Each structure stands twice: as structure tokens, then as C-alpha cells.
């Protein structure tokens, strides 16, 4: 009736996916044994959306995952639910990553992505029907950007009438193993802006900025970082995986949120900023704990309350609270802003109060929405590009395999078009 | 076929020289990079047409 | 995680067998063949104890190449502290060597021995498919030196496609040297083997002299001390591949992390927390002084002022062995507050790397038990003067046309020396044109 | 003249003769190395002389 | 299985009498004249009691025709230490000795007894119907040498048909012998004994000399200790037809899985888990180091690097005495890793053959109570270095032209030596060039041989 | 005849290029000179070595 | 013009004796040494007759 696949990638996308399904099975508890731990027996359809049929009421994901560094996945296979996966995900080798964008983009990945497309093709039809693709994809490594871009391309020529869910980690000046990542960014979203349906500007140095400064956490590690981002995107996709009365479907989300179908970079924030470490243990009521919904300095993107131009919002609650206070809070935060009074955006009243039982909390407060601060994120990406490229530095690492300069030139033409269009929107 | 192979090289020379190398930005250096890689692939096709045809 | 190393020159074979003896002593690879930690004879190949190959019935050998035209060096190696488990079938040597020059070993008398060692390289290249570059040991005038390398790098870059490699160039020291024409072979080696390279770093014997007589207060300038120190340094370098830890990245990752340009190609290996029986007794080890004592002039392989030395990169290597906790504490205790003079229009992201599973320290040497490693592989654009001084001496000795007659009748011409001067002048003036900070 | 230029580079391509495969495998490897030297130099100069005309 | 045993030359007759008396002490043939176990005269009539059958006088005598024109070896097989246990009247002496000259045997000095050996093989070939081939004890140049084996093989291939011609072509050590001319007959071996044969083996003498001088430490560097160890290897190979039972891995599938090709004709042998008489003091009986020292040069007859010789076949053989379930118990010991370089078009697994009945131990030598064995016999391309050594010796001798006028005025020809060189080159290139993985024929554009 | 015409035609087909720029391409230009003169001499000696 | 000069250099080729199997192992090394010395001088004369006649 409604099925979503499980394709992952990268060396960081795979581990954030491991944490993702760990924390979204935290409220499900689906055992890997076969004792049939039912979360809710009326939710056979809403376990079948993600955990698909393999036996009699044994529901497992469409578990296929690929990378050339097997140590990370062999480490995360010994997790809480790290063994409830089909013996078909193990499609890989030992060629190495090396933070090489060309080998994931052009040379090494072209001999291995055929097996991945074959297994997703032979796994897609083994259900009622196909509805959605999803991917936890990263840019911190080298291979992941290239093979994710080529996989999105191949699913464009192979499955055009299907949505794909593309998580995308933005580069970071604060945590970085190698620094070539401006080149890993300027020719990754060069075609991703016209290849996929919806994307995410989950940042990394704004994310570390809110992890360090505005939370005062003594854990600058990938552990609590993955905990926070997995909780945030779990609160995001809880709406899509639990359709109570609202939280419209896949193309329906693309219908009401995407004008000018390149401007599909919505920024997922989260209100209470609960974190393993310093914790606040009161029942989160609506107004004074959903007051962290509108503040632009409290999300996974570098923004500004006055230097910001929103044109869509979304809020999917989880507690059994009322909606009058939600509506008056929305009225205040939507009538307060002078720059928000533009000729566009007549109606974005989509807000959910669905009774979904959470993992450690009892409610939630999620933000999903576009802005023009993604333009200044791409502006600092562009200034890193000018720091790295204006003397053609470090291009000998990558030009030997299959690349040249004119792909970068058309990428910069697309960046100039994006900057010009978003500046036109800012002064419209 | 030898006179064919010399008169075509003559027509790769003749009909299209490099366009006027003056464009109103630094993008004319970019299109001169296009044309030097274009002469690189003319090198390519000219070593095809003598070695994979008469060799 | 597999690589086979070649070594040419007398000092090249010396540092090679010293470093391989240190490897076999610190992995437990005994002269009994097997390692007693498990039940595999000869050696092993699991993840990082991977310097072997299944030659016999599980028999594993420390795969390396030892080449020199002078024949007694392999005999005095083979009667050393690691006696009989070197290979009885690939120790290929000549009869009469080039005897301290360049031209004869390269062009004339080595031309019938290049193909023999090339066939040996092909026979060892029919073996296990692990390949992450090379490790070539050579000098400028030690044994054959430049004569083999100046031909075999071209042969590797033409015959073996465009495969990556790495080489070791022993930068000489005129206070303990044995020749006078070292500017000529140095300038020739530097225009030949560096333009056909993928990675390299130069180690100065005069730097070892400085850190021994001026920083450790020992009174013995012998090549055994140099061999032990090179064994320690190259063992610390290779310990990323040799032992797996938190950031156990490959040498391919290092060479695809370091080099910015074909001309901008060389690092400044910064490792001088100098130690012996004197400077290891009852001291205390901390992550402040060993890291604060890096940028100073009397810690460097090649001499540079700290303010005048501009770091295009500041890569670092740690032997770790206790925690990554104190390393990620020193990333703020030392590394975060670094507003030191840098290069313009380039990223200022400091890199650290920790590799666990301790390599055992040298037995029977001089240094006592030590823990930390500060092998900070930076780079310096102001090493143009470190070869411009040799170009100045080569100008003051080359206008007199000295030692030209030994380098005329072996194939070359005066245009070759003019081209070598042109190449080093091009490298230097390219550094003061765009390497040193410009607009 | 283009006629004489490409006919003469064709004529020196005829000075790239068929080999003498007599010998062992090592002699054939030395012949192979001489072949790689001559092919490398001669196609590099073919593309260079084509670029000196146009490409 | 009643194959005709031919033994010519000094080494052939020497190891023939030695190995057949080893069968006598193995099958219980006492110097009385008959066994005390089975009372059938001469020999038995079991499946394994089949080498000894009724041909002579009703007494089932041991079956081996002993011919050599050197008369002293026929004398010391007639007047050695056993006088009646062999054929009582069928050993015919030779009248004039070849005296270390091979080329006299094929053309001049051995032609008078070719009719007699044809009569003997017609006598011993119209016998019982079991005949899987010939147990040829080949030699090069000691007595007659390759002469009688050569003429027997050529007239047996053009007159008797297409029977198998199992050879023990000894390639002896020049240190212990006295001849120098031996490369000439060892390279005429390819012309006159290799093409018209059908299956062959190899026995050697250099490795036994190497272990007797250095490793086994026996002060006997002569043909006697070589006979003492080659008797063990001949008993080991004949134990397939000699020890019948549940695991009688006999010659039938052995001849199938040895040789793949016409000129892959030459196998290899690696039997050396030996324990000496000075090691015969209740030492370690090992099933681990005999598996761990297989590809080391100690077991190898010719010092060759396994790192360069690819294998198109591998025939494993562990003959013990302890348990038939120890077959499985030793399958699960060391066979799991075995990452050995192979041709890309050959199988990988290892055959298993055991003889769990314990044998009778040979006394008065340099061997303990040997019960278990390892032998990794196969056809390897790593004998290309040994044949290149032999061809280097022959090229140096042909540049020196030693004994050329000795070896041309009797029936040979310089063009015959050229054709022998081409036959040796064919046996080379089926192991040097064709024998290595020839994958470079698929397709690529670099300037290769299209 | 045609051989020496070919050799001198290739000699005049190697002109000295103009000196201009910030001395990057000049070293490649010197390399092109020395190499291409070397193989034109090689073609000369091969042609006059067959004859 | 230099078609007799290439016959002169082919006479320098014709000044080559055989490498003398009837030659002591010290002596045909001397033949090889005077060979390489004389073609060093011949290469100097060859670049002389290449550079000088081009003007």
C-alpha cells in the first residue's frame, strides 16, 4: 500500500543512518530475532512503509548499503538492531576510499554502482508498489559525494516517477579531516539542484556552532552529533511515516513547498535542543517551549531573523496538546515580521498535532522551511571556492582521472545564476 | 584513399579557424581553453584518420 | 595495505636494513621466521602487519629491494644483526661500482644492469596486488645514488603508466661528506627525479649533526647513529600503515593530503623532541613543550626562520599509545590558539592524526623509554633559499667549469648543465613569484 | 604546404617499420620498449607539428 | 595391473634389485623361497598380491626382466645377497660393456640383444590380462642407459600400439657420478623417449646429496644412500597397487589427474618428512611441520622458487597409518588458507590418498619407523629453471664441442641434434611461455602483437 | 633527395617562438626544441642507415 | 647535397669491425670503447652538420 526503500551511502552517511534507524526503532523496538515484537498492531501499514515484508510478520528494511571501507559497517552491525538486515546489503569490495572524489564519481564507482542499481531494481518490485527513495548522503568524505551524485543521476534515467529523499551534509571549516571539500561541494550540488526532488541544508559548522556555543556541551564528538541530527530528522520524517490526518504525501510535499523547482533546500531545525549531557526534564508545554520555533539562530543553518526570507513553514507535534495556543503562536510569529510581507506566500498553515508516542520525550516541535540564508551558506561556499581556486590550487589531484575545467566553469555559472536569482528574490 | 585524407585535413583547417579571440570578459580565456582542447581533439582525430585508416 | 620498497646507494642500503631491522624487532618478527604472537610462519598479512608475501608453505619474507653496484655492502649487511632471513635470491649487485660520481653509473655501465633489476621488479610485481606507491631510498652521492634513480624514475613513469610512488633523498652534509662536486649531482638529481615524482621528502645529515652535537650533547658523528635515527623517523612515518588506531589512514591518503603542485612538492619534516640516554632519564612527557618546540629554527631538517617560513600545510602525525583524549585536549591547549604567520589565500585548518598500537622502541640503542611523537609534516615555501645557496655555490664554482671533463664523454653536453641551472632557477624564482606570498 | 607536410609525416610514419619478432621474451621486451619510445616520440611530434599548422 | 618391469643401466638394475627385495621384505618373501603367511608358492593371488603371478615354472616368481650389456651389474644382481628369490633362470647376462658411452648402445653395442629383449617382452606381454602400462626404470648414461629404454619405447610405440609408458627418468647428480657427456644423452632423451611415451615421472639425486651432506647428516654420498631413499619413494608409489583397501587410491585415476597435456609430460616430487637413524630415538611424530614445510626447498628435488612457477594441477598425497578418520581430521588442519598462485583456468582442490594399514620397515639404513608421509607431486612450470640449467649446460658443451666426433661417427647427425634441440625447445615453451597464464590475448590497444 | 628535403623541411618547421609571458612556458619551449631536434636527427640517421 | 655526407657517415658505420668472437675479453671491450668514443665524435659532427647547414 505504501513502501519506502533503504539505500544508504558514504562513510558518514552510513553511520548517521545507523543512528537514524536506531533512534526511530527506539519507539518501535523491532527485534532481530523473530519473536515479533509488535510496536502497535494497528500499525502494520506504518511498519510496512519502512520495514518491508520478508516472512510472516517479519518486517525488515530494504537493506542495501554500499561503501569501500568495510570497517565502519562491520562496527555498526554489532548494534542494538544492527543485525536485522537482509543478506543482500553486502555489495562491496576493498578498493579503499582515500577521500577521493574522482573514484566515487568517475573511475572506481562506475564498476560497482551497477550492482547497487541491479539490487535496488530487483528489490523495488518485491512489494505492493513503490512510493519513495531515501538516502543519507554526505560530503565530508571524498567518494560519497561522487557516487551519490551518480546514483541520483542513474535513478533519474531509471525511475523518473519516484521521489528520492536526499540528506546532504554541508562542508565544515570547524571539523574537517581534509580540506579540498570546496571542490567536493561546488561540483556536487552543481547538478543536484536539477536532479533530485527535495534536499536538506543540514549544516556542519552551524551545527557544531549550536553544539558548542549555544548549548555548552563538552562533547565535540560525532556521537552526540549523530544523536542530535538523528533525533531532528526523526522528528522531521515522523510526519511522513505516521499520517494521522495531515502531513501530506511525497509529491504533495513537493507540490506545496517548491516554487521554481531548483529552490528545494529547506533547512531542518528543532526547537528544544535536547542533548545527551546537559538536560532539561520538564514536560514541554506548547508556548514557552515552542518559542524556540521562530528564532533563526537556533537551527541547523546560518540564518538571521531580519536578514531572512521564509516562504514555507511546517510543525509536526507529538504530544496530545491543544491547537488554540499553537494557532495564536503561529499568528504572532507570522504577523510580527515586516520583511515576510512579500507578494508571494499567501498560505503556509500546515501544522500537525498528531498523537505520536516518542522515544525519550513526550512531544516535539519541528521546523521545516526554505529561506534565502541558504544563499549565504552558498556564499561562504563560494568564498572558500575563491580561496582555493583563483590560483588553480590542488587541481592536479583530481584532473588526472576524468575531469577538466569547464565542468567547474558551468558549475560557477550555475552558482552565479543561483546568487542572482536569490538576490532578485531578496529585493523583490 | 589518400587524397581524401589530405583534402579533409585541408577542410578541418579551412572552414573553421578559431573564432575571434576577443570576448567581453575573462570568459574568452575560457573559450580559448575550449579551443585548445578542441585542437587537442583535432590532434586526436588526425591521428585516427592516418593510423586507423591507412595503417 | 601492501607496498614493496627499493633501496639504492650504500647509505640507502644502510638506512634500509636499519629501518627493516627496527620493523622486524618492533612487530616481533623474529629471526626464527615466525612471529610468536600467533601460529603463522615467516610473518603475516592481516591488516597492518602486511609487509610480507606467501612465498613458501605459508613462509613470509620481509619484502624489500637492496641494490648497489659495489658488492661488499650486501655482504656486510648480511652478516649483521638480522643475518640469514634476507632474501637469498634477489640481492642483486654488480662487480665494479661507479665510485662516487653520476655519469658512469647512469649512462654507461649501469645500462646493462638497469634491465636486470627491472626484470626483478617485474618478477616481484607479478606478486600480490597491493600497491600504494613506492618507497625509494637514495642519496645524492653516497653509493651509485643519482645514477640509478635518474634513469629508473623515468623508466617507472614511462613503463609503469602513471602510478604513484615515493622516494627518500638523503640531503648531504659537507662536514662529514666524501666528495666536492655535490652541487653538480644535487642540481642534476633535483631537475630529474623531482619532476617525475609523486611524493618525496629530503632528510639532511647536517640537520642530524645539528640536533646531535648542538641539541643532544653527544660526541659521536658516525653513520650508525644516522642509521638508527633514520630508522626511528621512517618507522614513525610508516607506523600509520604498520599499526591501526583511531585515524589509521593510508600513505595514499597522506600523499593525496599533502602535495599542492608539481613544483610545490616538498615538506619540512618537524620532529626534534631529541632523545638519548641523556635526554630521556627522569624527564616528564607532556603535550605542550614537544608541540611548542616545532616551529623554532633549531628543530628543522632544512633551515628556515619561523616568521619567514610560511606553512602551506601543517599536517601532523602522532604515535598516541595512551588516549586520543589528551590529543583532542591539546587540539585546544596548543593547536587552537595558533595565530602564527601563515600563507595568504589558503585554508588555515590544522590537521592531526593519531595511530595506536605502539611500535616498540629501539633495543640496544641509546634512547630510553619514550612515549610521544610530534612528527608534524608541515611544508615551507621558503626552502627556496635552501637550494638557492647551492645554486650560488654552483654559480661560483661552475663559471670556472670545474669537474666538467669527467661529465662530457658519457653522453651529456653543457646544455644539460645549463638546463639543470635553468630548472632550479625556475623552481626558486617560481617560489619568489607565487610561492612566497604574492598578490 | 599542407600536402607536403602530411605526406611527409606519413612518409616518416612509414619509417616506423614492422618489427623483428625473432628472439626470446626478453629480447621481445627490449623490442617492446624501443616500440614504446618510438611511438611516444613520433605521435607527440605528429600532434606538435599539427598544432604548428593548426592542430 | 600386472605391468611389465624393465630395468636397464647400472642405476636401473641397482634400484631394481633393491626395490624388489624391498617388496620381498614388504610382501614377506623370506630367503627360504616362499612366504610364511600365505602358503601359495612364489606369490599370492589377491588384489594386491598381483605383481607376483604364474609365468616361470608355477612358482609365482617376482616379475622383472633384468637386461644390461654391462656384465658386472648382472653379476652383482646374480651374486649379491639374494640368489634364488628373483627369476631363477630368466636373467640373461650381457657380453660386452658399453662403459659409460650412451651412443654405442643405440647404434653399435646394444643391437645384438634387442631381439632377446623383444623375445622377453613377448614372453612377459602375453601374460595375464591386467596390463595398465610399464614400470620403466629409466637411466641416462650409466650402463647402456637411455639406449635400451629408447629402442624399447620406440618399437613399443610403433609395434605394440598405444600402451602407457610410465617412466622413472633419473636426472642424476654430476658430483657423485663420473661422466661429463651426460647433457647429450639427457637432451637426446627428448627426441627418442619423450614423444612416443604416454606418461612419465621424475626422480632426482641432487636433493638427497644436499640433505645427506648438510641436513640428514649421513656420511654416505654415493649411489648406495641414493638407492636407499629412492627405494622408499618407489615403495611409496607402488603402495597404491600394493595396499588395497578402503582408500586404495590406485594408478587408475592417478594417471588421469597427473598430466593435462602432450608436453606437460614431466611431473615433480616433494617427499621429505624423513626421520633419520640418528633421529631414531623416539622423537616428534609430526603432522604439522610436514604440512608447514611443503613449499620450502627442503622437500623439493630441484631448488626452484614456488613464487614464479604457476600450477595447472596439484595432487596432494598424505599416506599415514593411524586413522581413516584422520583423513578428515587432517583435511581440517591447514587446507583452509592455501592462497597459492595458480593459472586462471585450473581447479583448486587437493586430492587425498592414504594407506592406513601399517607397512613393514626396511632395516639397516638411515630411516626410523616411518609411518606417515607428505608428497605434493604435481606438474609445475617451476621446472623451467631446471631445464634452462640443462640447456645452458648443453649450449656451453656444444660451444665446446666435447665428444662430438665421438658422437657422430656411429649413426647420429648434426641435424638430428638440431631436431633434438627443437624437441627440447618444444618441451621448454610448453612450460616457459605457454605454461604461464596466457591471458594476454583478450584485447587492448598499446602496440602489442595483434 | 626527398629524404634531405624532408629533414630540412622539418628543421624549418621548428621555428623559435616569441618570448612573452611570465616565464612559465619558456622551459617547455626549450624542452620542445631539444627533444624535437633529437628525433629529427634520429629520423635522419635511420633513413641514411638503411641506405 | 648531403646525400654523399650520409654515405660518409655510412662509411663511418662501415668502419665498424665485427665484435670479434676471435677477440680477447679485454680487447673487444677496447673495440667497444673506441666505438663509443668515435660515435661521440660522430654525434658532435652530426649536430655540426645539422646546425651549420640550416643557416
Swiss-Prot record, chain A:
One biological process term from GO is: mitotic cell cycle
Q: Kindly give the InterPro entries that the UniProt entry links to this protein.
A: Beta-tubulin_BS, Beta_tubulin, Tub_FtsZ_C, Tubulin, Tubulin/FtsZ-like_C, Tubulin/FtsZ_2-layer-sand-dom, Tubulin/FtsZ_GTPase_sf, Tubulin_C
Question: Where are the N6-succinyllysine modifications?
Answer: 58
Residue list for modification Phosphoserine? 40, 172
Sites bearing N6-acetyllysine, chain numbering? 58
* Entry-annotated residues carrying Omega-N-methylarginine: 318
Where along this sequence does the record place binding of GTP?
Answer: 11, 69, 138, 142-144, 204, 226
Motif MREI motif boundaries: 1-4
Cofactor(s), names only, from the UniProt record: Mg(2+)
Main location per the UniProt record = cytoplasm
Q: Which residues carry this modification: Phosphothreonine?
A: 285, 290
Task: Share the record's PTM remark.
Answer: Some glutamate residues at the C-terminus are polyglycylated, resulting in polyglycine chains on the gamma-carboxyl group. Glycylation is mainly limited to tubulin incorporated into axonemes (cilia and flagella) whereas glutamylation is prevalent in neuronal cells, centrioles, axonemes, and the mitotic spindle. Both modifications can coexist on the same protein on adjacent residues, and lowering polyglycylation levels increases polyglutamylation, and reciprocally. Cilia and flagella glycylation is required for their stability and maintenance. Flagella glycylation controls sperm motility.
Q: Which Pfam families match?
A: Tubulin, Tubulin_C
Positions bearing the Glycyl lysine isopeptide (Lys-Gly) (interchain with G-Cter in ubiquitin) cross-link:
58, 324
Q: Which GO terms describe its molecular function?
A: GTP binding; GTPase activity; metal ion binding; structural constituent of cytoskeleton
Compartments annotated for it: namely: Cytoplasm, Cytoskeleton
> By its UniProt entry, which PROSITE patterns does this protein fall under?
TUBULIN (PS00227), TUBULIN_B_AUTOREG (PS00228)
Q: Which UniProt keywords apply?
A: Acetylation, Cytoplasm, Cytoskeleton, GTP-binding, Isopeptide bond, Magnesium, Metal-binding, Methylation, Microtubule, Nucleotide-binding, Phosphoprotein, Ubl conjugation
Q: A Gene Ontology CC term for this entry?
A: microtubule
What's this chain's function?
Tubulin is the major constituent of microtubules, a cylinder consisting of laterally associated linear protofilaments composed of alpha- and beta-tubulin heterodimers. Microtubules grow by the addition of GTP-tubulin dimers to the microtubule end, where a stabilizing cap forms. Below the cap, tubulin dimers are in GDP-bound state, owing to GTPase activity of alpha-tubulin.
Reproduce the free-text note on domains from the UniProt record: The MREI motif is common among all beta-tubulin isoforms and may be critical for tubulin autoregulation.
Curated annotation (Swiss-Prot), chain C:
Q: Which GO terms describe its biological process?
A: microtubule cytoskeleton organization; mitotic cell cycle
Record key words, sorted: Acetylation, Cell projection, Cilium, Cytoplasm, Cytoskeleton, Flagellum, GTP-binding, Hydrolase, Isopeptide bond, Magnesium, Metal-binding, Methylation, Microtubule, Nitration, Nucleotide-binding, Phosphoprotein
Question: Where in or outside the cell?
Answer: Cytoplasm, Cytoskeleton; Cytoplasm, Cytoskeleton, Flagellum axoneme
Q: List positions binding GTP.
A: 9-11, 14, 70, 98, 139, 142-145, 178, 182, 205, 223, 227, 251
InterPro entries noted in UniProt:
Alpha_tubulin, Tub_FtsZ_C, Tubulin, Tubulin/FtsZ-like_C, Tubulin/FtsZ_2-layer-sand-dom, Tubulin/FtsZ_GTPase_sf, Tubulin_C, Tubulin_CS
Q: Does the keyword Coiled coil apply?
A: no
Q: 3'-nitrotyrosine: which positions carry it?
A: 281
Keyword Transferase listed: no
Query: What's this protein's function?
Result: Tubulin is the major constituent of microtubules, protein filaments consisting of alpha- and beta-tubulin heterodimers. Microtubules grow by the addition of GTP-tubulin dimers to the microtubule end, where a stabilizing cap forms. Below the cap, tubulin dimers are in GDP-bound state, owing to GTPase activity of alpha-tubulin.
Q: Could you tell me which residues carry N6-acetyllysine?
A: 39
**EC numbers for this chain:** 3.6.5.-
> Per its record, how is this protein called by name?
Tubulin alpha-1A chain
Instruction: Give the family from UniProt.
Output: Belongs to the tubulin family.
In terms of one coarse class, where is the protein primarily found? cytoplasm
Q: Which PANTHER family does this UniProt record tie to the protein? A: TUBULIN (PTHR11588)
What more the UniProt record tells us is: The highly acidic C-terminal region may bind cations such as calcium.
Q: Which GO MF terms does the UniProt record name?
A: GTP binding; hydrolase activity; metal ion binding; structural constituent of cytoskeleton
| Recorded catalytic activity of this chain's protein | GTP + H2O = GDP + phosphate + H(+)
Q: Which cofactors is this protein said to need?
A: Mg(2+)
Q: How does it assemble?
A: Heterodimer of alpha- and beta-tubulin. A typical microtubule is a hollow water-filled tube with an outer diameter of 25 nm and an inner diameter of 15 nM. Alpha-beta heterodimers associate head-to-tail to form protofilaments running lengthwise along the microtubule wall with the beta-tubulin subunit facing the microtubule plus end conferring a structural polarity. Microtubules usually have 13 protofilaments but different protofilament numbers can be found in some organisms and specialized cells.
Binding-site positions, Mg(2+): 70
UniProtKB/Swiss-Prot annotation, chain F:
Places the protein is found? Host nucleus, Host nucleolus; Host cytoplasm
Give the residue ranges for region: Disordered: 11-37
Where does the record place Basic residues bias? 24-35
Per the Swiss-Prot or TrEMBL annotation, the motif Nuclear localization signal and RNA-binding (RRE) is positioned at: 22-38
Q: Where is this region: Homomultimerization?
A: 6-14
Record note on what altering residue 23 to A/K does: Decreases methylation by host PRMT6
Record's comment on post-translational modification: Asymmetrically arginine dimethylated at one site by host PRMT6. Methylation impairs the RNA-binding activity and export of viral RNA from the nucleus to the cytoplasm. The methylation site is still unclear and either occurs at Arg-23, Arg-26 or Arg-27.
**Which superkingdom, per the lineage?**
Viruses
**What does its UniProt record remark on the domains?**
The RNA-binding motif binds to the RRE, a 240 bp stem-and-loop structure present in incompletely spliced viral pre-mRNAs. This region also contains the NLS which mediates nuclear localization via KPNB1 binding and, when the N-terminal sequence is present, nucleolar targeting. These overlapping functions prevent Rev bound to RRE from undesirable return to the nucleus. When Rev binds the RRE, the NLS becomes masked while the NES remains accessible. The leucine-rich NES mediates binding to human XPO1.
**What is noted besides the main data?**
HIV-1 lineages are divided in three main groups, M (for Major), O (for Outlier), and N (for New, or Non-M, Non-O). The vast majority of strains found worldwide belong to the group M. Group O seems to be endemic to and largely confined to Cameroon and neighboring countries in West Central Africa, where these viruses represent a small minority of HIV-1 strains. The group N is represented by a limited number of isolates from Cameroonian persons. The group M is further subdivided in 9 clades or subtypes (A to D, F to H, J and K).
Q: Which family does it belong to?
A: Belongs to the HIV-1 REV protein family.
Report the protein name in the record: Protein Rev
Amino acid at each position: 500500500m505504501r513502501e519506502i526503500v533503504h539505500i544508504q551511502a558514504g562513510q558518514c552517511g552510513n553511520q548517521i543512518g545507523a543512528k537514524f534507524w536506531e533512534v526511530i526503532s527506539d519507539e518501535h523496538g523491532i527485534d532481530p530475532t523473530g519473536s515479533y515484537h509488535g510496536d502497535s498492531d494497528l500499525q502494520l501499514e506504518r511498519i510496512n512503509v519502512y520495514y518491508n515484508e520478508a516472512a510472516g510478520n517479519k518486517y525488515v528494511p530494504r537493506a542495501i548499503l554500499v561503501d569501500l571501507e568495510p570497517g565502519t559497517m562491520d562496527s555498526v552491525r554489532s548494534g542494538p538492531f544492527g543485525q536485522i538486515f537482509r543478506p543482500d546489503n553486502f555489495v562491496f569490495g576493498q578498493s579503499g576510499a582515500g577521500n577521493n572524489w574522482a573514484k566515487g564519481h568517475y573511475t572506481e564507482g562506475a564498476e560497482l554502482v551497477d550492482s547497487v542499481l541491479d539490487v535496488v531494481r530487483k528489490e523495488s518490485e518485491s512489494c505492493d508498489c513503490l512510493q519513495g527513495f531515501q538516502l543519507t548522503h554526505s560530503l565530508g568524505g571524498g567518494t560519497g559525494s561522487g557516487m551519490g551524485t551518480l546514483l541520483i543521476s542513474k535513478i533519474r534515467e531509471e525511475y523518473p516517477d519516484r521521489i528520492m529523499n536526499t540528506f546532504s551534509v554541508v562542508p565544515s571549516p570547524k571539523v574537517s579531516d581534509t580540506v579540498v571539500e570546496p571542490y567536493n561541494a561546488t561540483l556536487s550540488v552543481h547538478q543536484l539542484v536539477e536532479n533530485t526532488d527535495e534536499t536538506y541544508c543540514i549544516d556542519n559548522e552551524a551545527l557544531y556552532d549550536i553544539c558548542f556555543r549555544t548549548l555548552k556541551l563538552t562533547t565535540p564528538t560525532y556521537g552526540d552529533l549523530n544523536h542530535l541530527v538523528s533525533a531532528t530528522m526523526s522528528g522531521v520524517t515522523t510526519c511522513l511515516r505516521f499520517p494521522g490526518q495531515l502531513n501530506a504525501d511525497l509529491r504533495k510535499l513537493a507540490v506545496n513547498m517548491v516554487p521554481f523547482p531548483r529552490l528545494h533546500f529547506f533547512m531542518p531545525g528543532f526547537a528544544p535542543l535536547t542533548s545527551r549531557g546537559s538536560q532539561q526534564y520538564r514536560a514541554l508545554t506548547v508556548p514557552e517551549l515552542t518559542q524556540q520555533m521562530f528564532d533563526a539562530k537556533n537551527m541547523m543553518a546560518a540564518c538571521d531573523p531580519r536578514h531572512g526570507r521564509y516562504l514555507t513553514v511546517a510543525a509536526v507535534f507529538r504530544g496530545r496538546m491543544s491547537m488554540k495556543e499553537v494557532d495564536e503562536q503561529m499568528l504572532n510569529v507570522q504577523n510580527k515580521n515586516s520583511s515576510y510581507f512579500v507578494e508571494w506566500i499567501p498560505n503556509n498553515v500546515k501544522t500537525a498535532v498528531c498523537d505520536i508516542p516518542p522515544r525519550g520525550l513526550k512531544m516535539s516541535a519541528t521546523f521545516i522551511g526554505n529561506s534565502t540564508a541558504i544563499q549565504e551558506l552558498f556564499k561562504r561556499i563560494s568564498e572558500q571556492f575563491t580561496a582555493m581556486f583563483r590560483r588553480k590550487a590542488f587541481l592536479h589531484w583530481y584532473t588526472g582521472e576524468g575531469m577538466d575545467e569547464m565542468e567547474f566553469t558551468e558549475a560557477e555559472s550555475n552558482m552565479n545564476d543561483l546568487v542572482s536569482e536569490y538576490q532578485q528574490y531578496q529585493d523583490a | 584513399d589518400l587524397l581524401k585524407a589530405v583534402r579533409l585535413i585541408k577542410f578541418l583547417y579551412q572552414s573553421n579557424p578559431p573564432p575571434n579571440p576577443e570576448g567581453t570578459r575573462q570568459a574568452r580565456r575560457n573559450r580559448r581553453r575550449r579551443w585548445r582542447e578542441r585542437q587537442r581533439q583535432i590532434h586526436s582525430i588526425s591521428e585516427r584518420i592516418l593510423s586507423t585508416y591507412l595503417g | 595495505r601492501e607496498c614493496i620498497s627499493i633501496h639504492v646507494g650504500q647509505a640507502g642500503v644502510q638506512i634500509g636494513n636499519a629501518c627493516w631491522e627496527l620493523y622486524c624487532l618492533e612487530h616481533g618478527i623474529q629471526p626464527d621466521g615466525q612471529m610468536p604472537s600467533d601460529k603463522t610462519i615467516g610473518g603475516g598479512d592481516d591488516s597492518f602487519n602486511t609487509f610480507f608475501s606467501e612465498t613458501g608453505a605459508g613462509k613470509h619474507v620481509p619484502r624489500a629491494v637492496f641494490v648497489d653496484l659495489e658488492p661488499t655492502v650486501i655482504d656486510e649487511v648480511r652478516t649483521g644483526t638480522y643475518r640469514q632471513l634476507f632474501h637469498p635470491e634477489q640481492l642483486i649487485t654488480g662487480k665494479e661500482d661507479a665510485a662516487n660520481n653520476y655519469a658512469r653509473g647512469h649512462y654507461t655501465i649501469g645500462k646493462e644492469i638497469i634491465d636486470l633489476v627491472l626484470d626483478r621488479i617485474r618478477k616481484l610485481a607479478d606478486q600480490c596486488t597491493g600497491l600504494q606507491g613506492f618507497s625509494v631510498f637514495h642519496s645524492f652521492g653516497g653509493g651509485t645514488g643519482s645514477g640509478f634513480t635518474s634513469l629508473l624514475m623515468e623508466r617507472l613513469s614511462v613503463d609503469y603508466g602513471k602510478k604513484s610512488k615515493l622516494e627518500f633523498s638523503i640531503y648531504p652534509a659537507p662536514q662529514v661528506s666524501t666528495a666536492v662536486v655535490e652541487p653538480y649531482n644535487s642540481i642534476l638529481t633535483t631537475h630529474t627525479t623531482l619532476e617525475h615524482s609523486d611524493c618525496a621528502f629530503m632528510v639532511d645529515n647536517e640537520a642530524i649533526y645539528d640536533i646531535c652535537r648542538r641539541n643532544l650533547d653527544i660526541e659521536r658523528p658516525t653513520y650508525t647513529n644516522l642509521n638508527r635515527l633514520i630508522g626511528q623517523i621512517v618507522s614513525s612515518i610508516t607506523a600509520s600503515l604498520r599499526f591501526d588506531g583511531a585515524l589509521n589512514v593510508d600513505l595514499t591518503e597522506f600523499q593525496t593530503n599533502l602535495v599542492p603542485y608539481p613544483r610545490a612538492h616538498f615538506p619540512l619534516a618537524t620532529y626534534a623532541p631529541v632523545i638519548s640516554a641523556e635526554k630521556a632519564y627522569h624527564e616528564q612527557l607532556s603535550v605542550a613543550e614537544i608541540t611548542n618546540a616545532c616551529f623554532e629554527p633549531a628543530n628543522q631538517m632544512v633551515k628556515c626562520d619561523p616568521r619567514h617560513g610560511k606553512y602551506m600545510a601543517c599536517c601532523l602525525l602522532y604515535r598516541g599509545d595512551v588516549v586520543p583524549k589528551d590529543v583532542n585536549a591539546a587540539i585546544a591547549t596548543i593547536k587552537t590558539k595558533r595565530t602564527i604567520q601563515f600563507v595568504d589565500w589558503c585554508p588555515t585548518g590544522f590537521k592531526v592524526g593519531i595511530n595506536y598500537e605502539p611500535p616498540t622502541v629501539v633495543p640496544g640503542g641509546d634512547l630510553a623509554k619514550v612515549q610521544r611523537a610530534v612528527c608534524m609534516l608541515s611544508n615551507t615555501t621558503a626552502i627556496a633559499e635552501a637550494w638557492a645557496r647551492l645554486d650560488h655555490k654552483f654559480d661560483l664554482m661552475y663559471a670556472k667549469r670545474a669537474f666538467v671533463h669527467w661529465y662530457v664523454g658519457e653522453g651529456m653536453e653543457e646544455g644539460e648543465f645549463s638546463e639543470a641551472r635553468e630548472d632550479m632557477a625556475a623552481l626558486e624564482k617560481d617560489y619568489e613569484e607565487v610561492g612566497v606570498d604574492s598578490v
